[PDB]
């Protein structure tokens, strides 16, 4: 199958409370497998998926040392950003970092990611060519010029193509079926009368993995995008996801409406009707 390893870092300055708080979470696809929190008791990387628990203490100790050095790096990034943005020393600020590798079935890099958000806004992102940067604003152009001059894209590219893919390969080997699985959605339609002239049809997808899914309503095969209420895909808490899509239907017209469900676990999309 197609797979990814991604790390999501959040650093938050707490002015007058010492070092910024550093949090990391690590994922294979939509499966969280590790966390690190600079505020936890005896900060150490911790397992959050069953198949990583087999890693020896040399794993947890090594990753702990890397996270501690990352936290200090992010502290310096936050200090530099304060200067670029002419910000005071009194305000709290956030750096979000995400990097990782997507591989196809051959297990070679398909797509590399390495990107940054400052105070909840795009800052700078490594472009899909892994050779060039997109800066969100004039401040981020300072970082872009520095990173271009220092040829850092070449090191990030070599990392994403090499080490990143090798760790992902090992984790897929550890995880086996727990990571290879595509759990198809359980689908059903419910009917919710509004008045005597109209009813909501709600098309549900439950218990699917991974999270990526498309739910659409059609009326005699014509897409109803503008008249569909679609909730954000939401976690069930058992490493499956949920979604629903709803459309308001005139009474007697229910059999014109079809719900269409596309998911990796379905060889072809499912078509459902109010039944």
């Amino acid at each position: 199958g197609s797979h990814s390893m991604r790390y999501f870092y959040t650093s938050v300055s707490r002015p007058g409370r010492g070092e910024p708080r550093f949090i990391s979470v690590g994922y294979v696809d939509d499966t969280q497998f590790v966390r690190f929190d600079s505020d936890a008791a005896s900060p150490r990387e911790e397992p959050r998926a069953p198949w990583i628990e087999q890693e020896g203490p040399e794993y947890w100790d090594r990753n702990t040392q890397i996270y501690k050095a990352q936290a200090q790096t992010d502290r310096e990034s936050l200090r530099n950003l304060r200067g670029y943005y002419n910000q005071s020393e009194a305000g709290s600020h956030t750096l979000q970092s995400m990097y990782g590798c997507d591989v196809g079935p051959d297990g070679r890099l398909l797509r590399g990611h390495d990107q940054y958000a400052y105070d909840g806004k795009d800052y700078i992102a490594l472009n899909e060519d892994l050779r060039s940067w997109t800066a969100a604003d004039t401040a981020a152009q300072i970082t872009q010029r520095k990173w271009e001059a220092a040829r850092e894209a070449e090191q990030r590219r070599a990392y994403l193509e090499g080490e990143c893919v090798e760790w992902l390969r090992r984790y897929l080997e550890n995880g086996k079926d727990k990571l290879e699985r595509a759990d198809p959605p359980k689908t059903h339609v419910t009917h919710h009368p509004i008045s005597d002239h109209e009813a909501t049809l709600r098309c549900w997808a439950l218990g699917f993995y991974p999270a990526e899914i498309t739910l659409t309503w059609q009326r005699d095969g014509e897409d109803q995008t503008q008249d569909t209420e679609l909730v954000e895909t939401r976690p069930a808490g058992d490493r499956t996801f949920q979604k629903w899509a709803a459309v308001v239907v005139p009474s007697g017209e229910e059999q014109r409406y079809t719900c269409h469900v596309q998911h990796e676990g379905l060889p072809k999309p499912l078509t459902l009707r109010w039944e």
Binding site: N63, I66, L81, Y116, Y123, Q155, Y159
Partner: peptide
């Protein structure tokens, strides 16, 4: 595993 290369904005 987390990467051990570090970069400053």
């Amino acid at each position: 595993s987390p990467r051990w290369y570090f970069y400053y904005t």
